Amino acid sequence: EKTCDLVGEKGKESEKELALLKRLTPLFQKSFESTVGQSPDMYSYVFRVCREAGQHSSGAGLVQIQKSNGKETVVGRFNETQIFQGSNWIMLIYKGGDEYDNHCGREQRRAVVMISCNRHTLADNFNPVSEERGKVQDCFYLFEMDSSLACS
Amino acid sequence: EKTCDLVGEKGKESEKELALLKRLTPLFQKSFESTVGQSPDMYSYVFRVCREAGQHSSGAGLVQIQKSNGKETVVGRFNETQIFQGSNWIMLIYKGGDEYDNHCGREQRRAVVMISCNRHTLADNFNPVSEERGKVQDCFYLFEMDSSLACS
Ligand SMILES: *[C@]1(O)O[C@H](CO)[C@@H](O)[C@H](O)[C@H]1NC(C)=O
Ligand SMILES: *[C@@H]1O[C@H](CO)[C@@H](O)[C@H](O)[C@H]1NC(C)=O
Protein backbone atom coordinates (compact mmCIF):
# COMPACT_ATOMS: atom_id res chain seq x y z
CA GLU A 1 0.00 0.00 0.00
CA LYS A 2 1.02 3.65 -0.38
CA THR A 3 2.21 5.97 2.36
CA CYS A 4 3.68 9.41 2.79
CA ASP A 5 6.31 10.37 0.25
CA LEU A 6 8.95 12.67 1.79
CA VAL A 7 9.95 15.91 0.07
CA GLY A 8 13.33 15.48 -1.61
CA GLU A 9 15.30 13.41 -4.16
CA LYS A 10 14.11 9.78 -3.87
CA GLY A 11 16.77 8.37 -1.53
CA LYS A 12 18.04 11.71 -0.23
CA GLU A 13 15.20 11.44 2.30
CA SER A 14 16.74 12.20 5.66
CA GLU A 15 17.05 9.14 7.87
CA LYS A 16 15.79 11.48 10.58
CA GLU A 17 12.47 12.27 8.88
CA LEU A 18 11.94 8.59 8.04
CA ALA A 19 12.33 7.88 11.76
CA LEU A 20 9.54 10.35 12.60
CA LEU A 21 7.35 9.01 9.79
CA LYS A 22 7.72 5.52 11.31
CA ARG A 23 6.97 6.84 14.80
CA LEU A 24 3.54 7.92 13.52
CA THR A 25 2.47 4.57 11.98
CA PRO A 26 0.01 3.78 14.78
CA LEU A 27 -2.09 6.75 13.56
CA PHE A 28 -2.19 5.65 9.91
CA GLN A 29 -5.53 3.82 10.09
CA LYS A 30 -7.13 6.58 12.13
CA SER A 31 -9.19 9.43 10.75
CA PHE A 32 -9.63 12.88 12.23
CA GLU A 33 -12.52 15.23 11.53
CA SER A 34 -13.63 18.69 12.62
CA THR A 35 -16.63 20.83 11.71
CA VAL A 36 -16.67 24.61 11.99
CA GLY A 37 -18.88 27.62 11.20
CA GLN A 38 -22.65 27.91 11.26
CA SER A 39 -25.17 27.01 8.57
CA PRO A 40 -25.33 27.53 5.53
CA ASP A 41 -21.56 28.14 5.74
CA MET A 42 -20.45 25.09 7.68
CA TYR A 43 -17.17 23.43 6.65
CA SER A 44 -15.69 20.09 7.59
CA TYR A 45 -12.04 18.96 7.71
CA VAL A 46 -10.89 15.35 7.39
CA PHE A 47 -7.29 14.50 8.18
CA ARG A 48 -5.41 11.25 7.78
CA VAL A 49 -1.75 10.36 8.27
CA CYS A 50 -0.24 9.04 5.04
CA ARG A 51 -3.64 7.83 3.89
CA GLU A 52 -6.45 8.90 1.56
CA ALA A 53 -8.59 11.52 3.32
CA GLY A 54 -11.19 12.48 0.72
CA GLN A 55 -14.24 10.61 -0.59
CA HIS A 56 -13.97 12.01 -4.10
CA SER A 57 -10.63 13.80 -4.55
CA SER A 58 -7.54 11.53 -4.49
CA GLY A 59 -4.06 11.82 -3.00
CA ALA A 60 -5.21 14.17 -0.24
CA GLY A 61 -4.08 13.85 3.36
CA LEU A 62 -6.24 16.76 4.47
CA VAL A 63 -9.43 17.96 2.81
CA GLN A 64 -11.81 20.86 3.40
CA ILE A 65 -15.48 20.13 2.64
CA GLN A 66 -18.14 22.77 1.98
CA LYS A 67 -21.23 21.14 3.51
CA SER A 68 -23.67 23.32 1.58
CA ASN A 69 -22.68 21.49 -1.64
CA GLY A 70 -20.25 18.70 -0.68
CA LYS A 71 -17.39 20.16 -2.71
CA GLU A 72 -13.98 18.88 -1.53
CA THR A 73 -10.95 21.21 -1.49
CA VAL A 74 -7.57 19.49 -1.19
CA VAL A 75 -5.54 21.32 1.44
CA GLY A 76 -2.51 19.05 1.26
CA ARG A 77 -1.37 15.83 -0.42
CA PHE A 78 0.61 13.18 1.40
CA ASN A 79 2.78 12.63 -1.66
CA GLU A 80 4.54 15.89 -0.69
CA THR A 81 5.19 15.38 3.02
CA GLN A 82 7.59 17.28 5.30
CA ILE A 83 7.94 16.47 9.00
CA PHE A 84 9.87 18.16 11.80
CA GLN A 85 10.38 17.59 15.54
CA GLY A 86 10.56 20.42 18.07
CA SER A 87 11.11 20.30 21.83
CA ASN A 88 7.87 18.52 22.68
CA TRP A 89 5.95 18.42 19.41
CA ILE A 90 6.01 17.24 15.82
CA MET A 91 5.04 19.33 12.82
CA LEU A 92 3.54 17.57 9.84
CA ILE A 93 3.25 19.32 6.49
CA TYR A 94 1.32 18.29 3.37
CA LYS A 95 2.04 20.41 0.28
CA GLY A 96 0.70 20.48 -3.25
CA GLY A 97 -2.93 21.30 -2.54
CA ASP A 98 -5.46 23.02 -4.80
CA GLU A 99 -4.43 26.61 -5.65
CA TYR A 100 -6.07 29.58 -3.96
CA ASP A 101 -7.10 31.69 -6.97
CA ASN A 102 -8.46 34.51 -4.74
CA HIS A 103 -7.37 37.30 -2.36
CA CYS A 104 -4.63 34.86 -1.24
CA GLY A 105 -3.04 34.79 -4.66
CA ARG A 106 -2.64 31.56 -6.60
CA GLU A 107 0.10 29.64 -4.80
CA GLN A 108 -0.81 26.05 -3.90
CA ARG A 109 -2.40 25.22 -0.55
CA ARG A 110 -0.47 23.39 2.16
CA ALA A 111 -1.59 21.74 5.37
CA VAL A 112 0.33 22.36 8.61
CA VAL A 113 -0.53 20.09 11.53
CA MET A 114 0.89 20.76 15.00
CA ILE A 115 1.03 17.49 16.96
CA SER A 116 1.56 18.41 20.61
CA CYS A 117 2.71 16.03 23.33
CA ASN A 118 -0.02 14.67 25.58
CA ARG A 119 0.98 11.58 27.55
CA HIS A 120 -2.66 10.80 28.28
CA THR A 121 -3.83 9.89 24.76
CA LEU A 122 -2.75 8.21 21.51
CA ALA A 123 -4.40 10.84 19.36
CA ASP A 124 -7.31 13.26 19.72
CA ASN A 125 -8.45 16.89 19.99
CA PHE A 126 -7.89 17.66 16.31
CA ASN A 127 -9.01 21.19 15.54
CA PRO A 128 -8.21 24.10 13.21
CA VAL A 129 -6.28 27.08 14.54
CA SER A 130 -5.86 29.06 11.29
CA GLU A 131 -7.95 28.74 8.13
CA GLU A 132 -8.91 30.06 4.71
CA ARG A 133 -12.62 29.40 4.75
CA GLY A 134 -15.59 31.71 4.27
CA LYS A 135 -15.26 34.83 6.41
CA VAL A 136 -11.98 33.49 7.83
CA GLN A 137 -9.20 34.61 5.48
CA ASP A 138 -5.82 33.57 6.88
CA CYS A 139 -4.44 32.25 3.58
CA PHE A 140 -3.00 29.62 5.88
CA TYR A 141 -4.18 26.27 7.25
CA LEU A 142 -2.97 25.43 10.72
CA PHE A 143 -4.28 22.50 12.72
CA GLU A 144 -3.46 21.27 16.18
CA MET A 145 -3.95 17.87 17.83
CA ASP A 146 -2.87 15.84 20.86
CA SER A 147 -0.71 12.73 20.83
CA SER A 148 1.62 10.93 23.21
CA LEU A 149 3.66 10.02 20.14
CA ALA A 150 4.93 13.60 19.84
CA CYS A 151 6.33 13.33 23.34
CA SER A 152 10.09 13.53 23.61
CA GLU B 1 8.57 53.45 17.34
CA LYS B 2 7.52 50.98 14.59
CA THR B 3 5.82 47.79 15.78
CA CYS B 4 4.54 44.74 13.96
CA ASP B 5 2.04 45.31 11.17
CA LEU B 6 -0.63 42.62 11.14
CA VAL B 7 -1.59 41.09 7.82
CA GLY B 8 -5.07 42.00 6.61
CA GLU B 9 -6.73 45.32 5.88
CA LYS B 10 -6.31 48.49 7.91
CA GLY B 11 -8.69 48.38 10.82
CA LYS B 12 -9.81 44.87 9.96
CA GLU B 13 -6.93 43.47 11.97
CA SER B 14 -8.53 41.03 14.38
CA GLU B 15 -8.85 42.06 18.02
CA LYS B 16 -7.72 38.51 18.66
CA GLU B 17 -4.43 39.03 16.83
CA LEU B 18 -3.94 42.52 18.32
CA ALA B 19 -4.47 40.80 21.68
CA LEU B 20 -1.60 38.33 21.17
CA LEU B 21 0.63 41.14 19.85
CA LYS B 22 0.22 43.23 23.07
CA ARG B 23 0.71 40.04 25.06
CA LEU B 24 4.23 39.74 23.63
CA THR B 25 5.37 43.35 24.18
CA PRO B 26 7.72 42.34 27.03
CA LEU B 27 9.98 40.72 24.39
CA PHE B 28 10.13 43.75 22.08
CA GLN B 29 13.43 45.01 23.47
CA LYS B 30 15.01 41.57 23.49
CA SER B 31 17.20 39.91 20.88
CA PHE B 32 17.68 36.25 20.05
CA GLU B 33 20.65 34.74 18.25
CA SER B 34 21.57 31.26 17.10
CA THR B 35 24.66 30.02 15.24
CA VAL B 36 24.67 26.77 13.27
CA GLY B 37 26.92 24.71 10.99
CA GLN B 38 30.69 24.51 10.92
CA SER B 39 33.36 26.73 9.38
CA PRO B 40 33.61 27.88 6.67
CA ASP B 41 29.85 27.38 6.39
CA MET B 42 28.56 28.87 9.65
CA TYR B 43 25.33 30.81 9.48
CA SER B 44 23.88 32.99 12.21
CA TYR B 45 20.24 33.84 12.94
CA VAL B 46 18.99 36.98 14.67
CA PHE B 47 15.35 37.29 15.66
CA ARG B 48 13.40 40.14 17.18
CA VAL B 49 9.74 40.67 17.95
CA CYS B 50 8.36 43.69 16.10
CA ARG B 51 11.77 45.36 16.02
CA GLU B 52 14.57 45.67 13.49
CA ALA B 53 16.77 42.55 13.49
CA GLY B 54 19.29 43.22 10.75
CA GLN B 55 22.35 45.44 10.78
CA HIS B 56 22.39 46.22 7.07
CA SER B 57 18.91 45.16 5.97
CA SER B 58 15.69 46.87 7.06
CA GLY B 59 12.17 45.83 8.01
CA ALA B 60 13.37 42.36 8.99
CA GLY B 61 12.30 40.55 12.13
CA LEU B 62 14.47 37.52 11.34
CA VAL B 63 17.70 37.49 9.37
CA GLN B 64 20.06 34.75 8.22
CA ILE B 65 23.69 35.84 8.17
CA GLN B 66 26.37 34.01 6.15
CA LYS B 67 29.46 34.36 8.35
CA SER B 68 31.99 33.75 5.59
CA ASN B 69 31.10 37.13 4.04
CA GLY B 70 28.54 38.83 6.28
CA LYS B 71 25.73 38.78 3.68
CA GLU B 72 22.38 39.29 5.44
CA THR B 73 19.37 37.40 4.08
CA VAL B 74 15.97 38.47 5.38
CA VAL B 75 13.74 35.48 6.10
CA GLY B 76 10.77 37.53 7.22
CA ARG B 77 9.71 41.15 7.70
CA PHE B 78 7.66 42.26 10.71
CA ASN B 79 5.61 44.62 8.52
CA GLU B 80 3.74 41.50 7.35
CA THR B 81 3.03 39.72 10.63
CA GLN B 82 0.62 36.88 11.39
CA ILE B 83 0.14 35.41 14.86
CA PHE B 84 -1.86 32.43 16.15
CA GLN B 85 -2.47 30.84 19.57
CA GLY B 86 -2.67 27.07 19.96
CA SER B 87 -3.49 24.88 22.99
CA ASN B 88 -0.35 25.89 24.84
CA TRP B 89 1.82 27.76 22.33
CA ILE B 90 1.90 30.82 20.10
CA MET B 91 3.01 30.85 16.47
CA LEU B 92 4.54 34.02 15.08
CA ILE B 93 4.88 34.43 11.33
CA TYR B 94 6.94 37.02 9.43
CA LYS B 95 6.32 37.11 5.67
CA GLY B 96 7.87 39.15 2.86
CA GLY B 97 11.41 37.82 2.90
CA ASP B 98 13.96 37.73 0.08
CA GLU B 99 12.97 35.36 -2.74
CA TYR B 100 14.34 31.85 -3.19
CA ASP B 101 16.46 32.02 -6.31
CA ASN B 102 17.25 28.28 -6.28
CA HIS B 103 15.85 24.73 -6.02
CA CYS B 104 13.11 26.04 -3.71
CA GLY B 105 11.39 28.04 -6.42
CA ARG B 106 11.13 31.83 -6.36
CA GLU B 107 8.43 32.41 -3.75
CA GLN B 108 9.30 34.85 -0.96
CA ARG B 109 10.85 33.55 2.26
CA ARG B 110 8.74 33.48 5.41
CA ALA B 111 9.79 33.10 9.03
CA VAL B 112 7.86 30.70 11.26
CA VAL B 113 8.55 30.76 15.02
CA MET B 114 7.11 28.20 17.48
CA ILE B 115 6.80 29.81 20.94
CA SER B 116 6.15 26.98 23.40
CA CYS B 117 5.00 27.51 26.99
CA ASN B 118 7.63 27.31 29.72
CA ARG B 119 6.57 28.80 33.07
CA HIS B 120 10.19 28.97 34.20
CA THR B 121 11.41 31.64 31.77
CA LEU B 122 10.41 34.89 30.11
CA ALA B 123 12.12 33.85 26.90
CA ASP B 124 15.06 31.69 25.83
CA ASN B 125 16.23 28.61 23.94
CA PHE B 126 15.84 30.15 20.49
CA ASN B 127 16.76 27.39 18.05
CA PRO B 128 16.28 26.56 14.33
CA VAL B 129 14.26 23.42 13.64
CA SER B 130 13.99 23.72 9.86
CA GLU B 131 16.08 25.77 7.47
CA GLU B 132 17.21 26.58 3.98
CA ARG B 133 20.88 27.05 4.65
CA GLY B 134 23.90 25.52 2.99
CA LYS B 135 23.39 21.82 2.39
CA VAL B 136 20.23 21.91 4.57
CA GLN B 137 17.46 22.41 2.00
CA ASP B 138 14.03 22.37 3.66
CA CYS B 139 12.77 25.44 1.77
CA PHE B 140 11.22 26.31 5.11
CA TYR B 141 12.35 28.28 8.15
CA LEU B 142 10.98 26.96 11.39
CA PHE B 143 12.28 28.16 14.75
CA GLU B 144 11.44 27.31 18.34
CA MET B 145 11.78 29.11 21.67
CA ASP B 146 10.58 28.95 25.29
CA SER B 147 8.46 31.63 26.98
CA SER B 148 6.01 31.75 29.86
CA LEU B 149 4.10 34.29 27.79
CA ALA B 150 2.84 31.46 25.55
CA CYS B 151 1.26 29.80 28.52
CA SER B 152 -2.28 28.63 28.65
C1 LIG C 1 1.72 14.53 -6.11
O1 LIG C 1 1.28 15.68 -5.44
O2 LIG C 1 0.57 13.93 -6.73
C2 LIG C 1 -0.12 14.84 -7.63
C3 LIG C 1 -1.33 14.11 -8.17
O3 LIG C 1 -2.04 14.92 -9.09
C4 LIG C 1 0.82 15.28 -8.77
O4 LIG C 1 0.16 16.24 -9.59
C5 LIG C 1 2.08 15.90 -8.18
O5 LIG C 1 2.99 16.21 -9.23
C6 LIG C 1 2.73 14.96 -7.18
N1 LIG C 1 3.89 15.64 -6.64
C7 LIG C 1 5.02 14.99 -6.41
C8 LIG C 1 6.20 15.82 -5.93
O6 LIG C 1 5.13 13.77 -6.52
C1 LIG D 1 7.01 45.63 3.79
O1 LIG D 1 8.16 46.48 3.56
C2 LIG D 1 8.83 46.20 2.29
C3 LIG D 1 10.07 47.08 2.22
O2 LIG D 1 10.62 47.09 0.91
C4 LIG D 1 7.88 46.44 1.10
O3 LIG D 1 8.52 46.08 -0.12
C5 LIG D 1 6.64 45.59 1.28
O4 LIG D 1 5.71 45.87 0.24
C6 LIG D 1 5.99 45.85 2.65
N1 LIG D 1 4.83 44.99 2.79
C7 LIG D 1 3.66 45.50 3.18
C8 LIG D 1 2.49 44.54 3.26
O5 LIG D 1 3.51 46.68 3.48
Swiss-Prot record, chains A, B:
Lumenal side: 1-152
Gene Ontology molecular functions: protein domain specific binding; retromer complex binding
Compartmental location: Lysosome membrane
GO term, biological process aspect, one: secretion of lysosomal enzymes
Main location: membrane
Domain of life: Eukaryota
Protein name: Cation-dependent mannose-6-phosphate receptor
Organism of origin: Bos taurus
Gene that specifies this protein: M6PR
